[PDB]
Amino acid sequence: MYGDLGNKLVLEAKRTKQLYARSNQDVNLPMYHEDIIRNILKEVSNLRKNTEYLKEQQQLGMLDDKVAKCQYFVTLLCMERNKRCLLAYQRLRTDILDSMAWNNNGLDLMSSITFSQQDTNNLSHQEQEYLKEYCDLITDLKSGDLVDIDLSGSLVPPSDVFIDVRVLKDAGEIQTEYGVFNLIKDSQFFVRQSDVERLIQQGYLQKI
Amino acid sequence: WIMNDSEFPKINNSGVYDNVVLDVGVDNLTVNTILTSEFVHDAFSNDALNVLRGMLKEWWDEALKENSTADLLVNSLASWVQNPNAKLFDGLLRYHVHNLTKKALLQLVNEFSALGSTIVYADRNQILIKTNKYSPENCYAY
Amino acid sequence: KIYPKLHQMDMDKVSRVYADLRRESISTGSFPITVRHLESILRIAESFAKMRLSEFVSSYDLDRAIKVVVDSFVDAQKVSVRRQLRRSFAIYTLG
Amino acid sequence: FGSGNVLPVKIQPPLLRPLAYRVLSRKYGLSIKSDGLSALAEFVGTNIGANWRQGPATIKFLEQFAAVWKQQERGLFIDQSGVKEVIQEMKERRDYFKVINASQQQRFSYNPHKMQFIFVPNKKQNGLGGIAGFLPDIEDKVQMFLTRYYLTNDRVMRNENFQMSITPIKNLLGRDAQNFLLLGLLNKNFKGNWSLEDPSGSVEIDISQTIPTQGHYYVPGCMVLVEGIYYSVGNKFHVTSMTLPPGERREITLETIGNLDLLGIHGISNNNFIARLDKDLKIRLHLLEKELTDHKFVILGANLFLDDLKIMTALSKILQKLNDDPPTLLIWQGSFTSVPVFASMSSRNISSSTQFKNNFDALATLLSRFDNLTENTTMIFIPGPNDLWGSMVSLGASGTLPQDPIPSAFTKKINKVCKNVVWSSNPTRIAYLSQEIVIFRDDLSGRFKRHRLEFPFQKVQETRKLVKTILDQGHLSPFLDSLRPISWDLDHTLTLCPIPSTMVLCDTTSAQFDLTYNGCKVINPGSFIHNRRARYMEYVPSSKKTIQEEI
Amino acid sequence: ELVKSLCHVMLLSKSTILEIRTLRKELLKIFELREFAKVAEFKDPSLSLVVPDFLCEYCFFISDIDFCKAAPESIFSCVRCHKAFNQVLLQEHLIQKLRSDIESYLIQDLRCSRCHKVKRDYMSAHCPCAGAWEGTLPRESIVQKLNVFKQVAKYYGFDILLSCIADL
Amino acid sequence: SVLAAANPIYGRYDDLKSPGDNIDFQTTILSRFDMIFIVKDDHNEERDISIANHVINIHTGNANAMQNQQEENGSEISIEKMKRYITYCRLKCAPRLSPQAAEKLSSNFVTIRKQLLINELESTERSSIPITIRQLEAIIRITESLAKLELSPIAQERHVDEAIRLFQASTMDAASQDPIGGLNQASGTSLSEIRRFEQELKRRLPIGWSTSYQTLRREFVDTHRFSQLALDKALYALEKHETIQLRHQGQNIYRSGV
Ligand SMILES: [Zn+2]
Ligand SMILES: [Zn+2]
């Protein structure tokens, strides 16, 4: 009864999980559910008022204790269920955010240039804050003892020394260690894989 | 709306005419309009209008009897009507005068339409009339 | 054997004729004109092209079709307005 | 970053790019362009002596160059600006205050479905606008009042007291009894009967037995909370109570909207992302009170006439004292002419536009005397009803609310005689550190008094009533489009959803006052000259004021 | 353009339509064009910008002046008496016309695209008829009006109106 | 589902005669159609030229040379793709209404059913096109069909507005034929009162200047000449393009011509 609304929220989470599960490429979180969450907040506030009222009505001594225990337990259980639903929804959304934050080579995400995967207004303000400190944590990890290893690098094993690549978007001359790449659009390169991993990750190159 | 309506209608019947055409110039349109003539919320007060009519009539009559100042007043009344810098100026008065002049021009065109002739143009200062006759030498009497 | 086409032709003349025919019907007339009568001019043009065993419709055939359609509409009027309608529609059929 | 070495030897970037690449592209950052690489050769060659085999110097230089790109947003490619950021770096080893006009203010729409503000790209930046780009589009006329209704209804529905709730009007079409709480525009139908209107529909209103809540103004064209009973024998909502929507403080309003930089001085926002900032507010509140009471900006009495001679003499006497302690800002407000300037068909006398020009040339003579006031004071020019462009149409009447600044053609050398002069629209927003002040000039009390509902049933109380209505309605124009036309796309300039910290509300028809309300301060300069007395008031950002008079 | 403008003058007869239209087609046969081509139709080369009711102080004459069609020696001189005008007055009247036009556009009324009718609501989405709200004065007209003022202010030297255009 | 096409009696709609004398379908069959479209020709020149050009492009071969391009780019899809989309949508989704959608639909039903009562009382004859509960269920079905396009699991007010607009365009337009004059028993006194009021209004108000509906009601009704049907008399005078114009949010009544 009281928790029947929160179940709906959990159902929404399930749908999001499917979009996370069936994702060939990175996806965007849907709109926040502040209205449903505020409805659970209102009903848990009403439950708190009911618990208070039971407290006074018992402590004036008009009702039997065994009777009051049952509604006390019911209100406590309903509040626990609502907390569980809200926490599960929040943790799923948090996990997806952490995954995206890791899958953009660290960086500040929305403030700096982003891969346009996510719109600003989908996330909540607290989620926007959380993402910022998580990105800072990734950043000061990457400057730790593991400087030589790029903790935000590619996770597919290297098995091809020389690859053919094609430019997707036009750009200017870019210096690389001991040379220069000229990014004329609709041109093909035959070069070592290590040099162009960064440019492939950022969408300026195609193929491998 | 009433202070933003200062456009006058015109007639521009175009073509090639093989009859005689007369080019008349109509002067004293506004003073003639003034001298001749609850529900409505956009009209000037009738009493002040009649006062102005009487003033113009007496001024014209004295101007006929060799009066320079009366002639100057009659000539300058039209300039006075449209000037906001002149005191006692009312936008309703200007709208009233323009609206009656507009009706007067159409009535004059209709009056010309009584005899065999056709309007070609009308600009408050020039009127072009198409006559039935074919030679200019035969229109002195008409 | 023959199947003529309509590659090069004057669209503006046909559009003007159709618009004039539509206007002069509701104003004074009792011969229903719709989009269904626009296509009859093109059909008659293709027929006149077939008569010549030609694979392309020329300007003469289209003009002849327009003249036929106009004469079929003018002569089904009242005697009062027929003389005015014939004069009004005479500019299109100059040839 | 240091000097005094032997000489700047020139070396090719080919022998410099590996270190820059390893420091920047690999670890953090990327895109060292060829031109940018060549640019980064000069400064590293400035101290080139005995290097490329040295220790920390080059690495620290690259670290410092990376510091700018973490600090500033910038981008990816490094261009000829690379020297421009090192200029900033050597820079590292009052301000931040602005005056925002009506036209330059950022535009924000509101989505009722999302309870959130959406940015609107400005047509001037991207649109060509070479011939006509200021002109609005018809769709704004359809949403002008819908936007007001959405903002006010959100606030009403988020109030603490309400949780009877407000019901849409069309939900009353079958009911024959009960009570309802209706919120909507109060106006007159095309039949001449009083009516209430909401986006859902409209209904006629009966005032024959209404008991209003005294303490504010009930003028047509404003949102009203109403209570009563609906009768289906006709179509009438018999009113029994009437009030106005409650007001909301800006501290509780900001949290709902997050930390949007509406009058963004922290930065700017585009269609991609928005800007928020919280930590700097504490330190800049500290700086506001960090013994900066020396700051002193002064609003003169409104409606000062330049053509009059006594007014000019009084202004000279006032500037005599202002020279001693130069104000931080000096706001000249009110109509600068005592007669509307129009086409002036008569050319026997000198033209009124030329007279307008001449009256702004005597100001240069009177101002050039006082050199210190020129040197360290910024002047803000507010227009009035009888200025140049408006009076060409309204002929002295009050028309469109967004009023453009005085043309720069007829006032040219006052920019030379004075150092800092800014012309501003009729409604403007002074952004001073962590403070927003609104400048507005019109006669509000007369129009309130003339247009009241007049229910069928010490002077400073009117000031409190005016303040409460203006602040609770959250809008500077609680009037229909009939009384005052409004530019369709500039209406956001006139909507006070976040209550300003300090308000400048001058009315010649209302006596001077100093009132406080839910999180703001309202002051009323007015009537520059009165009873042979010339008055002007001082206000300090530390919330103290003074009145200074000079016969 | 010469042949089109020469034929247009003959065309204003209403009694020799067929005779002139045959000659027009024959002349258009010299070019590779057809008698009903859109490129072969005559349009007025000039726009119009009429300032009504200008006063001659020494003549007491009411005249309407059009700044586009009228040739020079007439823009800056009265008709009845050849007395020169004052230029800044003309510029101020042009500015008055421009600002009045902008105001008139800003205070227009709305209409239904199908039910030609006036909008009688302050907050509505469309007609009770399924339709849309359109304007009585479309934007294109006022854009063209602002366009012609710029050219008028540049052919003749009107500094004040040129400044007024750039402060918008 | 049933898609039907038919012609009226006499071929054309003949807007001069009553709707009941034009539609031969009884109320029993007309209540089972969710949307009824009455189609008429307006004989406008601009539309005629546009249609003529469009039809000539079809015949001269210029049609295909355009159509493929749009079907290629982003604006059209082939018949087979649309068929597969239709079957996928019908076999995958079945939306549901929201609490606010029902509230918005109930008020619209009440409004559209009230209007019919005034129309029938004024015309003193029963309506040929009926409005019933099936007309509410039709709007519900249209809302859910609109939701089905986007594979949405819930129907909201966005779809409700478009469904209401479609119903107004289809059936309410057909019901509201608004006869200018039928010369029947209804408004029988109006057969002379219309001319009487027109003369009284055209003698009071010259070709310039304006009045108000408030005054034109109060003063002309103090003499007890009110008929309760003068709302459309002003519009009929406006139809003459000279007698009446309505301006300033409908408050101002302007005399524009003879
Ligand atoms: Zn003269
Ligand atoms: Zn409509």
Side-chain angles (χ1 to χ4, degrees), chain D residues 298-304 315 331-334 441 506 525-529 535-537:
Chain D
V298 174
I299 298 89
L300 282 72
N303 208 4
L304 59 92
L315 286 151
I331 314 160
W332 287 352
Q333 173 184 180
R441 165 73 168 81
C506 316
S527 178
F528 182 67
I529 190 167
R535 314 151 321 171
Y536 62 98
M537 52 156 48

Side-chain angles (χ1 to χ4, degrees), chain A residues 31 42 110-113 120-121 125 128 142 147 171-180 198 202, chain D residues 17-18 21-22 25-27 30-34 37 73 76-77 114 116 163 258 272-274 276:
Chain A
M31 294 299 291
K42 292 181 181 180
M110 192 85 68
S111 86
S112 194
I113 184 66
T120 64
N121 285 275
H125 307 290
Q128 288 150 23
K142 264 142 81 183
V147 176
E173 300 177 63
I174 316 296
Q175 313 264 350
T176 196
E177 199 194 1
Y178 308 109
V180 176
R198 181 214 322 141
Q202 302 192 133
Chain D
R17 88 160 73 92
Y21 182 87
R22 274 162 301 221
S25 278
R26 168 175 333 270
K27 278 192 45 54
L30 54 88
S31 280
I32 296 90
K33 266 220 183 162
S34 199
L37 179 66
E73 279 325 284
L76 293 82
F77 300 166
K114 295 193 301 170
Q116 204 262 329
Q163 195 45 243
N272 181 237
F273 68 96
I274 46 181
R276 290 148 276 204

Side-chain angles (χ1 to χ4, degrees), chain E residues 56-61 78-83:
Chain E
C56 172
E57 321 176 330
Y58 292 100
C59 179
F60 286 108
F61 184 50
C78 168
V79 186
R80 274 221 291 261
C81 60
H82 307 288
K83 196 47 177 32

